[PDB]
Every structure is written in structure tokens, then in C-alpha cells.
Design a binder for this molecule. Sequence first.
Ligand SMILES: [Mg+2]
Ligand SMILES: [Mg+2]
Ligand SMILES: [Mg+2]
Ligand SMILES: [Mg+2]
Ligand SMILES: [Mg+2]
Ligand SMILES: [Mg+2]
Ligand SMILES: [Mg+2]
Ligand SMILES: [Mg+2]
Lengths: 328, 328, 328, 328
Amino acid sequence: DKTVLDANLDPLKGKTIGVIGYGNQGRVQATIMRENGLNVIVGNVKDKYYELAKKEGFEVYEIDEAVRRSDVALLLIPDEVMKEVYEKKIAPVLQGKKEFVLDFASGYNVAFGLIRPPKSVDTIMVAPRMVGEGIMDLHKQGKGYPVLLGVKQDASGKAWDYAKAIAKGIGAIPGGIAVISSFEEEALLDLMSEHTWVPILFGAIKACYDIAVKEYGVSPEAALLEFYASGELAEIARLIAEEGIFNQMVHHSTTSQYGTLTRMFKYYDVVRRIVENEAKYIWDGSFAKEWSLEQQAGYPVFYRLWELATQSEMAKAEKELYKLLGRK
Amino acid sequence: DKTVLDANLDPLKGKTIGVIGYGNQGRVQATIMRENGLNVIVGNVKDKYYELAKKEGFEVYEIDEAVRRSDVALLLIPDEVMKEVYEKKIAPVLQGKKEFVLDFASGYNVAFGLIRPPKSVDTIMVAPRMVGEGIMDLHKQGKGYPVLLGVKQDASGKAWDYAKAIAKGIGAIPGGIAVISSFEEEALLDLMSEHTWVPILFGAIKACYDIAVKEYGVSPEAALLEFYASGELAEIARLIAEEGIFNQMVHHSTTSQYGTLTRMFKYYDVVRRIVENEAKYIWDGSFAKEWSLEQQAGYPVFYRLWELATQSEMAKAEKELYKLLGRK
Amino acid sequence: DKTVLDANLDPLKGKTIGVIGYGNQGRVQATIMRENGLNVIVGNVKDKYYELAKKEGFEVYEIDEAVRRSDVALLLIPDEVMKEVYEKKIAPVLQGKKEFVLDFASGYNVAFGLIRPPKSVDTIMVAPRMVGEGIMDLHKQGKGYPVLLGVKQDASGKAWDYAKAIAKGIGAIPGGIAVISSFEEEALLDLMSEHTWVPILFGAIKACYDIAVKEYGVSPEAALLEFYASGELAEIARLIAEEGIFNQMVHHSTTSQYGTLTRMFKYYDVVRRIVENEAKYIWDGSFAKEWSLEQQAGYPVFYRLWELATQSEMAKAEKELYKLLGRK
Amino acid sequence: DKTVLDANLDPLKGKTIGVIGYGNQGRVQATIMRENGLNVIVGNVKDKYYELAKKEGFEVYEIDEAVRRSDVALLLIPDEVMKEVYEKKIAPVLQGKKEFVLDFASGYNVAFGLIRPPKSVDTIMVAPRMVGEGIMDLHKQGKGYPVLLGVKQDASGKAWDYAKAIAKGIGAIPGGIAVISSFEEEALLDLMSEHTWVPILFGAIKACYDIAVKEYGVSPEAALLEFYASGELAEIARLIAEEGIFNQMVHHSTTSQYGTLTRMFKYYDVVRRIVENEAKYIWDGSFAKEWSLEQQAGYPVFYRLWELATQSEMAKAEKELYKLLGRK
Ligand SMILES: [Mg+2]
Ligand SMILES: [Mg+2]
Ligand SMILES: [Mg+2]
Ligand SMILES: [Mg+2]
Ligand SMILES: [Mg+2]
Ligand SMILES: [Mg+2]
Ligand SMILES: [Mg+2]
Ligand SMILES: [Mg+2]
């Protein structure tokens, strides 16, 4: 298979590594690889995070100054402001560099060409598949966790080895796994979830509520308990994560099993259509354009939709209810 | 008719002419009108082209400094960066001008309002219909060549005479012809080709290849020889340029003639529909918006499509083949 | 792969070869294989071509008399009159033959069953992919060129070896290549081009002209210069043949690239449909019937369409223009 | 206008004229131009018509022998067997001719390319618009009648003058008129009537009968009297020919006028569609192919449809009725 379970750690030994950004991923991975025996500096703009970063024992300079001292840089910052940070501060210093390894956690800005590093650089990806908080919950146990790897540009014949070395340094392998993939195959996946089954789920729940209340005379206080105000969803999700998606359904009643299976096979093509459309929209580079242009215009649609959703009937009722259950 | 075969050359005699840009068109036309007895300066930003330009005997200043010394300016630079060059460097000096003639080779930026010169200026067009390289191949022979002319703004009652004078200076007439037209009628035409029959041709060839290989069991090495890897296309194009489009078909077999004619009349309306749609899209100013916005967003779609086309099956096979024929 | 680069020449040495027909292919290949050390006779009906053929040093008899002296025959005559020539003159003599190799340049009449030679014969194909004139332009340079090969009927266990021997004799390999294929895979390809992208191209150009003139007020003298009366087409075709189809587009402006790519991917399915339909029409044997029946009826449709095309508006305008440019 | 009322008669004086065929048109026109002072020979194959032809005082030879003695030939024979008569007998002699005028009454075989005379010949048309019988009914009165004229090929600069001379010789002008037109504009018209309004009329009558009998309980003996077994139709046709198409309706009742006008404007587009389709079918040369192929196959469809029509219910009833009225 394409699965890597463990690999060597030598190429990073002797070099210095700069961790750009000290958010969730930055903090965690920085700490872990400081623990695995590697000299690390941190680069950040001076605010709260800078205080905490220098508190935890890391020597900190400005971003560009950190890029100069480093043979490897990890850009662990949001994808929404990385472009400007790169053009302003990193790209010049980088033109003033020799043999550089550039690692990312997301492939959005590179897959779609918004960041185009030079040829003297090894361009790689090491993408976790976690919230970021739970990686420490799993690290103290000595457990690994999964990651995706990719190489966009190789000028050293060793980029894959550097990728695996990083994968080990961050503490994902051994114990977890590491899949080799592309920048594209990562952005595509990350976006497909956000565009296909999450919103469909939310809309279906909303529609169930609306229909039940406005057509069958149900009370708002009752529909919410059944549809999402109860913790049935998280339970089912846990059983999925642990026992398996279909095997999870054994613990339910046969009536439920039958209805679920029948209707799953009944409405399958309908959603496959949607998924096809959205995946095609992404692969072509259209959504990136949409999103960049909305940023430039001032986020009007974003604003209006946030207002509509929060000022909906279901949300008002949920507010009253949570106010009543005591849940904050 | 509207066709002009030769005209006077006096209005440009006594004046100075500045040639902004020294690319293909710039170099050629600059040289020609230096040869036809006119004092010429060149304006360019300092790089390789500046070296060659001063080498060939032209006195060169910066752009703005050239606009100051000139009563006429020819903006022979790409349409993709002319807007900024105009707003930064030319428009101020031009506000500090008196009686100025402004000539373009393309009407894209003026037809759609991206460049709006003042009223003290004569705004004209002189548009060649060549690659640019072959104009010298035709000049040494004393041959002319065709051009289009247009006037957008007249403040001197002599703009057409200036246009014809330029047409002669560049060496298009006499021997060739000069059609009088609009900025709009030039942009429209230039874009219609790029949007209607070129891409349709390419897609049809691609589809022929795909179908033949994936449905009738043909080898990739064979389909390419028939469809485009042979030089039949260029031959047919030459016969079209010389003998005529339909008369060209005499040299082929009657079987070919019959099939071609029948299927040409069969599928005519289908493509007429497409051409209508695209021409309407252009006339309204929508494509200009599309293209400007893609520039502002960072060329994501451009990037992705360039990748898809080059990483297609046909392209890989063509690479192997050309590698085999010895053709580079 | 299936590609053959060079092979032996022995099986043809000791045998005699008759070249039926002395047109373009006949003349060229006859001369070449006379030069490569093979005894050759020529068979033709007595007219101008017979004079030239006996002039160039070939001994000539009537067709049947040439088939009698020959162990191999090359039928290099039009596909439109080969059927009668075969039934009248060749098939009888051939019934009076022993061990015969029959080679064709086109597979139309054999693929569709219009010519069905007996079992005592080796039926083969050697199909050039050139105009015929340029093969000499490439021969004096020692350059090869590509061909397709096929075997329809083998009664000697050596038909493929004979095919490769012929391929070498005609001077295609070495230096070029030789693909092994079928009679069907040759007729199909030759006809698909004549039915799919050539007529689509012509109709699209015609539609562009008609629309521009009758809906946007453009002059006829101007549309023609842009669409086909200029030599841009042949240039693009040459760059395709040499540099590659997509790589060719680097030399153009980014505006052109963007529009072309977008519209190519936009209108792809539309033409794929057409190509599917026409390829299916061919594979089934329907077009052969259509064409044979039109021959029998007297070419009325052919006639009328030739009239309509030549008496069209675009053609009249093109006549006036070419009359004006000086181009004949 | 394009209308010719009378013209000169000199070019035919001194020449000899051969009238190929002695049917209706042949007999009539031959006689008339013998009366107008012109030497005439007749060419026909030897049967009944030959007897009558030599009876009426014309010297008769075989076809080819008549073409040899003649400077002008009129091919007044059916369009269904003219092709073979031309290829066998006329075309050879004609290759052995010098300065020849070839006249036709119909343009079917020339418009669609089934007969292609050489360049040494003046190819003309003189097309009557009569049954042929009534031309004598109009000649004794000194009345002219209308004809159409056309020129397909001119090699003498006098073809139109020859056409008008013929028009006068046949006795159409003066008194009638002569319109100048094309071979195409004659075949098109002659066929459009046979394909559009004649069959539509017949089918509408048939449908009226069928509906009335099988859905409203009318007797067959009654429907026929109303729809066509009475002479109302011929009366209306005469009033049309004489008074005018719309003015004809004054003699009818206002109820009839109102219904007719309303329904005429109501169903106009429906039939315009049909007429468009059929005219396009003709202009392209498709019907000629259809008809030629049915001839070659043996007239199966013709046969079957003749059977179906005659063995229909309406026809049986009409037979009984006519048997009853005494009308034969
Ligand atoms: Mg995400
Ligand atoms: Mg995700
Ligand atoms: Mg362009
Ligand atoms: Mg162009
Ligand atoms: Mg062909
Ligand atoms: Mg071909
Ligand atoms: Mg008729
Ligand atoms: Mg009629």
C-alpha cells in the first residue's frame, strides 16, 4: 500500500527549524518537536500569542528574522491571511536563501496558485487530521495519529525524506500512519465535506423542524429535543468512529435499521448528483475565485446569511429552550 | 468602397513621434518609420529591450520623458498592463499637454472604457493583422499589408488624415490596404476568433482522439498522426489563404468533398447558436469584467485549466510520440 | 509498444513488383523503391501519365499484363474507380494466380467489403500519412515518415514481414515509424476528420462572418482579414505540428489563452456528441451506402451544394478581396 | 420590370431547327413555328407518333440524324427518360458539333446536374405554363400566352436573344408575356405545387369524408356530393383564374366569407412550416435523389400507394356513385 508507518529522523538533525505562527497547530507541534530533540525557534507578530510563546521557553524573533536563521519553516497560520504575510515578509528573505524546505498544513493556497515559491525550495505538505486540541490528549499516551503528505516541488531529491522526518518530529508516527498524497487531494477533500454533507445535514434538520411545526401542529419545544437538542447525534458519531459506520446500526431497533437502509438506497443518486457538481466546481478553481472576490467586496453575503440563520425561528426557539434546560 | 489604398504623408512631417514600447510591433514599426524619413524617439522601461533599442540607433528616455517631447505617441505594449502604465506615467504628462495624437494597436481598453483620455487629444487606432515577424518578411519586398483604422475622439478635424499618415509611415500602404472601422469592430473581431472557432476546433480534435481510443480500440500512436501530428492542417490553411476557402477543396478527393459539404451544412445552425451567444457576451462588456476579476483574484482558473490540459491523456501520448519522431 | 522502427528487406528480393497506377503516390513510391534496389514494372491505362511513366525509365504494360508478371501488386489509384478496375481487369488474372501479395494504401473498399479477394492471396495495407508531394521533400534528406500497416487475410504466415519489407522499400522507415493497425482503424480515422472537425471549423468561420456582418454592422472587407483571409491559421497549424497543440499557446497573449481554454472546456460535450454520432454512422457501413448511391444517382446533391457554397455571400466578398490584394 | 412583351425574330432566320419529340408540346410548337415561317425537321423514335408526325407534313429522321442537320434542338420529351436518350444518341453527335443552341421545356435534369452539356453550347430554357392542349385553343385567336425563360450557359453572347426568338416562334409572345428566370426557379416552382397544396387539398377532402362518415353518421352518398362529386370546385377555380383569388369570394354568402377568412388566418403558420420544409428539401437536391433511387429499385412504394389509394373506402363509394349518376 501507500501507507507509511515509521521512517527515519536524521535529515532534521543538525538543521534549525522555524515555526511560523503560534496558534493551535503551532503551539502543539512546536512543543512536540522540542520534546523529540530538535532546536526550534518561533516566529510571530507581537501580541498575546507572543507572550505565551516566549513564556513556554521558545526564543522568538520577528517572522523574517526567523526565516533567516532557519533551514526549514512551518507556516502554521490561517489560510485567509497567509498570502499577504508571504508576499510582504517571507518571499523577499526567501529570495535571499539557498537550500530551503517549506512545509504547509493546508494546500489551498498552493494548489490554486495563490502562493508560488521559487525553484530553489522544496515545497512539501504535512497535514494533520485533528482538531488540534486532542493531539495532546493522544500524545501523552504515546499514541500517534494520521497525517497526509505531499510534495509540490523537489529541488533536492530528498523532499519525501524530509516530509517523513517532519511527520515523525510532530509525533504523528509511529503509532499512527502517514498517507502520501497531493496538495490537490487535500484541499479537495477538506472542501468537499464543508460543501456536501455538513450543509445538507443542517438543512435537513431545519426542514424537519419547519415541516413538523408548520404542517403537523407540533410544539417547538418538542421537535428540538428529537432532532438535535438531545445528545443522540454525538453518540451515533462516536459509535461510527469506533465500531464502524454500518456495524454501528446493530445497537438500534430493526424498525430503524429497515427504514434507514431503504431510504438510504432510495435517495442515493439525488445526493451523488450534488456531490459531483460541487467537486467539479472545486477542482476547476472556481470556489477560490468566489471566496477571494467576496473577501475583496467586504463580506456582504457572509454578513446577511449569518443574520438570516441566527434570526430564524428554529434559532429563537433553541435559545428559549437552552435558556430553560440550564445549558448555557 | 471603404477601402483606402494610399494617402498623403505630410501631417507627420515636422512633428516628433514617440514609440512607447519596444516589443515586436514596437521594434518593427519604429524601424520602418525611421526608414521612411521621420524623427523617432523610443520610450521604455530599462531592461533587455532597452539595451537592444538603444543598440539599433534609437535615442531612448523614460516613458514620461518621451511623452513630453512627442506630438504623437504609439502605445505598443500588452493590453494586460497598459492601464497601470497609463494611469501612473502617461495621464499626468498628458494633462500637461496641448495638441496630442494618441494611437493604439488594439481597442480593447478603449472600447470598454478602461482608458478614457481627455478631450484635448485625438484618439485613433491603427491595427495590423499580422504576427509581427512576417511584416519584415513582407517589407523588404516592398509589399504592403492590411490594417484597420478607427477614430474614437476628434478634437482637430484631422484625425483621419493622421491615421492614414501613420498607416503609410508604418509601411502597410501602399501595396496593402487600410480599412476604416471602429475600436469596437476590432476588439469584437479579435475576441470572436479566440472564443468561437479556435476552441471548437481544439475540442473537436480532442474528442476525436478520445472516442477513437476509448471506444474503437485504436492505438494512441495512430490517432495523433491522422488528427494533428501530421502537417496536413498547415497545408490546408495555406491553400485557404492563397486559393480560397472553398476552391481549396478541389485538390482533395470527391469522397472528402461530399462528406465535408454535407456535414458542413448539417451542423451549421448548431455553431451559429454558439457564435451568437459569445458575440453577445462580448458586445455587452461582460467578458472584460470576467477577465479583470480573474486577474484580481490571482488566476486560479487559468492555473487549474493549464494543468488539466497538459496532464491530459492526449498530451502525454503526444509527448511520447514527439520524443520518438525526433521532433523537439 | 506497437511501433516498428526498422525491419528486414529480404522477402522482396528475388521477386518482381508491379505498381498499378502512376499518380502521386504511384510515381513517388515507384521511384523510391526503384532507387532502393528492386525490379519494378508499372501498369496504367494509356494517357498523359503513361507518357511520363515510360519517360522516367519504367517499362510499362497494360494493367492485366502487369499483374501477370508480378508477385506483388500495389493498387495506387482512386478509391472511387478501383472497384470496376478490379472486377474487370485484376480479378480474372488473379484467379489465374498462385501466391500473390496484394497491397493497398486505403482500406475503404476492403473494410466495407466492396473488394473481396480470394484466399490464395495475402491482403495487406501500407498507408502513408502525407500529401504525397512532401514525401520527396523528406526523402532527399534521408528522412523517413510515418505509415500504418494492416493485414486482412494471411495465407502465407509471412504477411506482416511482407508489410514491413514494403514499408522499408517505400522509404518510410527507417527514420520514421510504422504503426500496426487494421483496415478498419484506417478508414475510420481518415473519414472521421473529413466529417467532424474540418466541416465544423468551416461552418464556424462562415457563421462568424455572417453574424458580424448582418448583426453588428461590420464591413465584409474587414471580417475576412481577421477570420481566414490572413495567414494566422497556417502559422498556428505549424506551431501545433512542431511545438505541440497546447504548448503552442504560450506565444499568444494571456487574454487569448484564458478565453480559449475556458470556451474549449465549456463547449466540449457538445462536439463530443457529434463525433460519437458520426463515428457510429461510419463503423456501421452506412456512409459507404450513402456515397455509393449518390454516385449511382448522378451526384445531384454534390452538385447543388457546390453551387450553394460558391454562390454564397462570403465567397463573393472573398473573390472581390483576393482580386484586390493581388493574390490570384 | 423583368417582363418581356415582344422581341425580334431574326436570329432563327437562316438556321435550321430540329424538334426532338412529337408528343403534346412537340406537336403544338412544331406546327406553330412551321406556320411562323421557319424550316423545321422532327426527330423521333419510330412508332405511332412517327406516323402522325410524317403525316402532318414534317420530314423525319432518327434523333441523331436530326441533331446533325440542326443548329438548334428542342428536347420536348419526358424528363424521366431524357437522360438516357441524351447520353446514348445526342451527346456524341453534340461532341461532333460547333455552335449549338440547346433548349429545354423543363429545368429538372439541368438544374440538378443530371445533364451537363459542354461549353461549345448555348443552354437555354423556354417553359410554357399550359396543359398543351389549350395552347391551340388560344393560338387560333391570335392570343399569346406566358412562358419562362432562362440561360444556364452562354458561349455566344446572344443566348438571351435566341431565347426571345424562340419565345416568339412558339407563338407565346406577342399577346402574352415572357418572364426571365433560372432553371432552378422553374424546377422549384413546378415541384412546390406538386408537394405542398395539391396533396394537402386531397388529404383534407379525404379526412372530411372519413370524419363525417365514421364519427357523425353521414351517408357516403351524401358526403361526396358536397366535398368533390359536385362541380363547385371547378367553378371556384375559374372565378379565381378570371376575377382574382380574394375578389372571387364576393359571389358567396357572408357566412362563408367570414368562416373562410377567419380559418385561413388561423391555420396559416401551420402550412407555412410545411412549405418551408418541402422547399428546403427540393433546393438541396434531395428529392431528385429519392426519385432516381425509387426508379432504380423498381417503383415498389409507388405501386403500393397507388393500390392503397384506389382500394380506399372513399374511392369504392365514388365508384358506386359515378356508376349511379351515369357519369362514366
Ligand atoms: Mg477546512
Ligand atoms: Mg475537514
Ligand atoms: Mg487577440
Ligand atoms: Mg486574431
Ligand atoms: Mg481521405
Ligand atoms: Mg486524412
Ligand atoms: Mg411538373
Ligand atoms: Mg405545375
